[PDB]
Design a binder for this molecule. Structure first.
Ligand SMILES: *C(=N)C1(NC(=O)[C@@H]2C[C@@H](S(=O)(=O)c3ccccc3C(F)(F)F)CN2)CC1
Length: 219
């Protein structure tokens, strides 16, 4: 049986909330956030990993990422696999602009061997993965102003669609005042939502596309 409530923050598997700025790096923050969870679960250390390393070094057709022009979490993971590593934020900090790649293997702080994609639209599979694997990268439709109006409760705007546009991180789930939710870490700083997080409707027919494109890496 799966736990009724999960919050990876409580297990020290989630780093501080980041601020992407004007750079379209949501995908990179979502990817590093999933890998940070796995790194903590394997090594016992909680380390912020370099979103900028992803932005600078996978901006080419091989990956179909475009740096600050947007990208995909699974292609971030594929880069880390191909590259044999990724740096920590501390040695490769965030600039919110495209830069020339300067990855250095002496500063490797994590690796990725493979990644897993969950079945499209399957919220039961997402629940199982969050409970048993760790934080999971997902895409959502975050294109409605109500997403930024949100401060507390469970986000469930009827104007959401299945047409996703932003990569974020699912770090838990539960039920709040009788409404099932996913606990989502964003990359808009602490001023977004509830200290950087939004609780999004769970079990409402794949609302906002949250279970359409779920993936997580393995160290
Ligand atoms: C983030 N600041 C911005 N969005 C992106 O870079 C997006 C993330 C992904 S997605 O989540 O929207 C996505 C769309 C369609 C199919 C699959 C996905 C997946 F797999 F990533 F979830 C694509 N670009 C605004 C730049």
């Amino acid at each position: 049986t799966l736990p009724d409530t999960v919050d990876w923050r409580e297990k020290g598997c989630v780093t501080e909330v980041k601020y992407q700025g004007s750079c379209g790096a949501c995908w990179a923050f979502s990817a590093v956030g999933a890998l940070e969870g796995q790194l903590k679960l394997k090594t016992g250390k909680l380390i912020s990993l370099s979103a900028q390393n992803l932005v600078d070094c996978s901006n080419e057709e091989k990956y179909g990422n475009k740096g600050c022009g947007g990208g995909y979490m699974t292609e971030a993971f594929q880069y880390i696999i191909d590259n044999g590593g990724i740096e920590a934020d501390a040695s490769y900090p965030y600039k919110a602009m495209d830069e020339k790649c300067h990855y250095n293997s002496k500063n490797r702080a994590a690796t990725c061997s493979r990644y897993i994609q969950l079945p499209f639209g399957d919220e039961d599979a997402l629940k199982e993965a969050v409970a048993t694997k760790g934080p999971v990268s997902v895409g959502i439709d975050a294109s409605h102003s109500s997403f930024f109006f949100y401060k507390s409760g469970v986000y469930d705007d009827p104007s959401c669609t299945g047409n996703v546009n932003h990569g974020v991180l699912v770090v838990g789930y539960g039920t709040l005042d009788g409404k099932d939710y996913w606990l989502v870490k964003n990359s808009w700083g602490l001023n977004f939502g509830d200290q950087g997080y939004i609780r999004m409707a769970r079990n409402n027919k794949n609302h906002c596309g949250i279970a359409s494109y779920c993936s997580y890496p393995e160290i």
